[PDB]
Design an enzyme around this catalytic site. Structure first.
Site, PDB file in Angstrom:
ATOM      1  N   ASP A 166       0.803  -1.267   0.061  1.00  0.00           N
ATOM      2  CA  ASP A 166       0.099  -0.020  -0.032  1.00  0.00           C
ATOM      3  C   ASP A 166       0.724   1.087  -0.038  1.00  0.00           C
ATOM      4  O   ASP A 166       0.547   2.265   0.762  1.00  0.00           O
ATOM      5  CB  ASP A 166      -0.841   0.099   1.192  1.00  0.00           C
ATOM      6  CG  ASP A 166      -2.219   1.093   1.009  1.00  0.00           C
ATOM      7  OD1 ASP A 166      -2.419   1.177  -0.371  1.00  0.00           O
ATOM      8  OD2 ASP A 166      -2.652   1.090   1.875  1.00  0.00           O
ATOM      9  N   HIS A 205      -3.439   0.558  13.672  1.00  0.00           N
ATOM     10  CA  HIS A 205      -3.023  -0.589  13.378  1.00  0.00           C
ATOM     11  C   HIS A 205      -1.343  -0.771  13.072  1.00  0.00           C
ATOM     12  O   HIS A 205      -0.944   0.279  12.881  1.00  0.00           O
ATOM     13  CB  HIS A 205      -3.538  -1.574  12.256  1.00  0.00           C
ATOM     14  CG  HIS A 205      -3.696  -0.528  11.154  1.00  0.00           C
ATOM     15  ND1 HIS A 205      -4.745  -0.008  10.548  1.00  0.00           N
ATOM     16  CD2 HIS A 205      -2.754  -0.182  10.180  1.00  0.00           C
ATOM     17  CE1 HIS A 205      -4.470   0.818   9.550  1.00  0.00           C
ATOM     18  NE2 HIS A 205      -3.219   0.557   9.201  1.00  0.00           N
ATOM     19  N   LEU A 260      -3.654  11.752  10.943  1.00  0.00           N
ATOM     20  CA  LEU A 260      -3.873  10.413  11.828  1.00  0.00           C
ATOM     21  C   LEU A 260      -4.708   9.685  11.141  1.00  0.00           C
ATOM     22  O   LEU A 260      -5.970   9.620  10.761  1.00  0.00           O
ATOM     23  CB  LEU A 260      -4.470  10.881  13.206  1.00  0.00           C
ATOM     24  CG  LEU A 260      -4.036  11.930  14.113  1.00  0.00           C
ATOM     25  CD1 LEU A 260      -4.857  12.224  15.277  1.00  0.00           C
ATOM     26  CD2 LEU A 260      -2.606  11.164  14.600  1.00  0.00           C
ATOM     27  N   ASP A 261      -4.087   8.688  10.302  1.00  0.00           N
ATOM     28  CA  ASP A 261      -4.639   7.904   9.383  1.00  0.00           C
ATOM     29  C   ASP A 261      -5.449   6.641  10.281  1.00  0.00           C
ATOM     30  O   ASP A 261      -4.843   6.275  11.176  1.00  0.00           O
ATOM     31  CB  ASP A 261      -3.432   7.207   8.663  1.00  0.00           C
ATOM     32  CG  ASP A 261      -3.999   6.286   7.534  1.00  0.00           C
ATOM     33  OD1 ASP A 261      -4.781   6.640   6.679  1.00  0.00           O
ATOM     34  OD2 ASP A 261      -4.017   4.799   7.765  1.00  0.00           O
ATOM     35  N   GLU A 287      -8.443  12.168   8.962  1.00  0.00           N
ATOM     36  CA  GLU A 287      -8.835  12.196   7.617  1.00  0.00           C
ATOM     37  C   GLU A 287      -9.820  11.403   7.867  1.00  0.00           C
ATOM     38  O   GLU A 287      -9.834   9.940   8.127  1.00  0.00           O
ATOM     39  CB  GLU A 287      -7.699  11.623   6.763  1.00  0.00           C
ATOM     40  CG  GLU A 287      -6.883  10.276   7.470  1.00  0.00           C
ATOM     41  CD  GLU A 287      -7.725   9.197   7.060  1.00  0.00           C
ATOM     42  OE1 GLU A 287      -8.185   9.027   5.861  1.00  0.00           O
ATOM     43  OE2 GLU A 287      -7.473   7.999   7.677  1.00  0.00           O
ATOM     44  N   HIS A 289      -3.572  11.674  -2.998  1.00  0.00           N
ATOM     45  CA  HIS A 289      -2.805  10.323  -3.362  1.00  0.00           C
ATOM     46  C   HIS A 289      -3.903   9.222  -3.741  1.00  0.00           C
ATOM     47  O   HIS A 289      -3.348   8.093  -4.269  1.00  0.00           O
ATOM     48  CB  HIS A 289      -1.662   9.940  -2.433  1.00  0.00           C
ATOM     49  CG  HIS A 289      -2.173   9.443  -1.265  1.00  0.00           C
ATOM     50  ND1 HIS A 289      -2.718  10.361  -0.258  1.00  0.00           N
ATOM     51  CD2 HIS A 289      -2.491   8.480  -0.516  1.00  0.00           C
ATOM     52  CE1 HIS A 289      -3.461  10.029   0.758  1.00  0.00           C
ATOM     53  NE2 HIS A 289      -3.058   8.472   0.597  1.00  0.00           N
ATOM     54  N   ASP A 332     -22.382   2.591  -5.597  1.00  0.00           N
ATOM     55  CA  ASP A 332     -21.734   1.668  -4.812  1.00  0.00           C
ATOM     56  C   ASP A 332     -20.223   2.030  -4.794  1.00  0.00           C
ATOM     57  O   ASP A 332     -19.654   1.618  -4.028  1.00  0.00           O
ATOM     58  CB  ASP A 332     -21.908   0.280  -5.154  1.00  0.00           C
ATOM     59  CG  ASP A 332     -23.341  -0.108  -5.011  1.00  0.00           C
ATOM     60  OD1 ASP A 332     -24.272   0.469  -4.379  1.00  0.00           O
ATOM     61  OD2 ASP A 332     -23.881  -1.004  -5.791  1.00  0.00           O
ATOM     62  N   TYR A 363     -17.027   4.057  -4.087  1.00  0.00           N
ATOM     63  CA  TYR A 363     -16.213   5.150  -3.230  1.00  0.00           C
ATOM     64  C   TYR A 363     -15.241   6.180  -3.711  1.00  0.00           C
ATOM     65  O   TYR A 363     -15.312   7.278  -3.319  1.00  0.00           O
ATOM     66  CB  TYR A 363     -15.558   4.355  -2.232  1.00  0.00           C
ATOM     67  CG  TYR A 363     -16.085   2.784  -1.504  1.00  0.00           C
ATOM     68  CD1 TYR A 363     -15.821   1.738  -2.220  1.00  0.00           C
ATOM     69  CD2 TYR A 363     -17.129   2.880  -0.488  1.00  0.00           C
ATOM     70  CE1 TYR A 363     -16.148   0.622  -1.723  1.00  0.00           C
ATOM     71  CE2 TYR A 363     -17.730   1.782  -0.176  1.00  0.00           C
ATOM     72  CZ  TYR A 363     -17.124   0.529  -0.624  1.00  0.00           C
ATOM     73  OH  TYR A 363     -17.658  -0.772  -0.503  1.00  0.00           O
TER      74      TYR A 363
END
EC number: 2.4.1.7
Length: 504
Positions: free
Chosen positions: A50, A88, A191-192, A232, A289, A342, A344
């Protein structure tokens, strides 16, 4: 947060491929244009599944990119925004590996959430069914602690194990991240996934009262260290207003699709409605991004009866308009969904989503800059970049259509383009006219025009926005007109590409 335009970039995709080089580009090619920068995750590794958001060691700069000292050097000239991934961490981290090996005897066992952490008494079907999900299925995967199978809480991928942000060990880890950011003179912390960071049985586990307690606790830890935090969150536009009234700063994710809709249809009422109610403690963007989010102006996705800022059909037409404007490029980059409600996000650069229309693109930036909030420009958009179909076919990662690798040579070549030069002059104007450090107001016709006005101490400026004037991807009629007042009196630009504004 300083009220100047910022750049969003990967350290390795803007220049020779390093933090030092990216710093060189910012200082020599964008002086006075971008006064701060959001450096996308540059930890170890930066080139995983990712693209930096799945680091194994969040505390160590990937040595292929540079070092924390490189960050500190940059801080001498630019305010720096960085990501803190608080929800996480990698299952390959030494902490989680130690739990797989030692189980409950691990020093870090309390650090990771399991089903039992949240539901020590069982869970009903309603308890689990009610958890807000960014990915299909339930937020659990199987790991063996010592040799006992446990269901570890995983909000996103099975490789990203959720931490207990109420545990001592969890907080110790989070503060090791903050401490390193402070030591290198970072200013802002994004803060993701913080919206998922608090779990409480019976709730959606997304932005619950416990979540706001967690955000407020991080804020205070940040200020002690000279850090300001930014959240975010993508959610239904009414949630967004509620959320922003409880936190220091949010993103404005409604504006990007609202401007696509306005420039494609000529309708300004949605933009006027959003201007009236939107949170102003915001960071403004057009591109990021990630893909272009359409979720943010549509109906609430849990209760479709709560309608968005434009009807469902206009949400669908916005997706298909990107597909048409890119002549199918964004179709190849965006996985199908059987229906665009549907969806995003739509994978496309913002310039390409507008059909590469310069007048529309500069108008979109001008509205962005004139709305209250700190503006950010994504590096692809800073260079008015088109969809990168070569990288897309090489990686098969849809979001890479909007993540081109810009060599220093390509940067200098694109700085020659009048649309790019217009954007640089516009950001300089947004940074240098003290009207924007003053008071904001706006007027509107009905559906034809909307005017954004800032009046400051020694200056004033009014941006009139009339998408009706230049409908069509091939149109060359300006749809944004500018008037302002500075040292040299009254000024006017009816064409922001050919006559970009300059402040005395």
């Amino acid at each position: 947060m300083k009220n100047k335009v910022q750049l969003i970039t990967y350290a390795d995709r803007l220049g020779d491929g390093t933090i030092k080089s990216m710093t060189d580009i910012l200082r020599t090619r964008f002086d006075g244009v971008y006064d701060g920068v959001h450096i996308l995750p540059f930890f170890t590794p930066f080139d995983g599944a990712d693209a930096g958001f799945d680091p194994i060691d969040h505390t160590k700069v990937d040595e292929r990119l540079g070092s924390w000292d490189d960050v500190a050097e940059l801080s001498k000239t630019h305010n720096i925004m960085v990501d803190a991934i608080v929800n996480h961490m990698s299952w390959e981290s030494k902490q989680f590996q130690d739990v797989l090996a030692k189980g409950e005897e691990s020093e870090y066992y309390p650090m990771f959430l399991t089903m039992s952490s949240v539901f020590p008494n069982g869970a009903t079907e309603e308890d689990l069914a009610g958890i807000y999900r960014p990915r299909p299925g339930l937020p659990f995967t199987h790991y063996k602690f010592a040799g006992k199978t446990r269901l570890v809480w995983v909000s996103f991928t099975p490789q990203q194990v959720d931490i207990d942000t109420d545990s001592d060990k969890g907080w110790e880890y989070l503060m090791s991240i903050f401490d390193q950011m402070a030591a290198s003179h970072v200013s802002y912390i994004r803060l993701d996934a913080v919206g998922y960071g608090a779990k409480e049985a019976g709730t959606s586990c997304f932005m619950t009262p416990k979540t706001f307690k967690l955000i407020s606790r991080l804020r205070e830890e940040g200020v002690k260290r000279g850090l300001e935090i930014l959240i975010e969150v993508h959610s239904y536009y009414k949630k967004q207003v509620e959320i922003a009234s409880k936190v220091d700063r949010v993103y404005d994710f409604a504006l990007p699709p609202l401007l696509l809709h306005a420039l494609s249809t000529g309708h300004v009422e949605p933009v006027a409605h959003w201007t009236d109610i939107r949170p102003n403690n915001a960071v403004t963007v057009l591109d990021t991004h990630d893909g272009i989010g359409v979720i943010d102006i549509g109906s609430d996705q849990l209760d479709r009866s709560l309608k968005g800022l434009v009807p469902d059909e206009d949400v669908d037409n916005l997706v298909n308009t990107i597909h048409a404007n890119t002549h199918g490029e964004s179709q190849a980059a965006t996985g199908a969904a059987a229906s665009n409600l549907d969806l995003y996000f739509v994978n496309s650069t913002y310039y390409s989503a507008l059909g590469c229309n310069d007048q529309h693109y500069i108008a979109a930036r001008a509205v962005q800059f004139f709305l209250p909030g700190v503006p950010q420009v994504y590096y692809v958009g800073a260079l008015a970049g088109k969809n990168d179909m070569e990288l897309l076919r090489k990686t098969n990662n849809g979001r890479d259509i909007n993540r081109h690798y810009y060599s220093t040579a390509e940067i200098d070549e694109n700085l020659k383009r009048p649309v790019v030069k217009a954007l640089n002059a516009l950001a300089k104007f947004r940074n240098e006219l003290d009207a924007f450090d003053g008071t904001f107001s706006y007027t509107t016709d009905d559906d034809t025009s909307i005017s954004f006005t800032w009046r400051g101490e020694t200056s004033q400026a009014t941006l009139t926005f009339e998408p009706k004037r230049g409908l069509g991807v091939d149109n060359t009629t300006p749809v944004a007109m500018l008037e302002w007042e500075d040292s040299a009196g009254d000024h006017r630009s009816d064409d922001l590409i050919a006559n970009p504004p300059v402040v005395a």
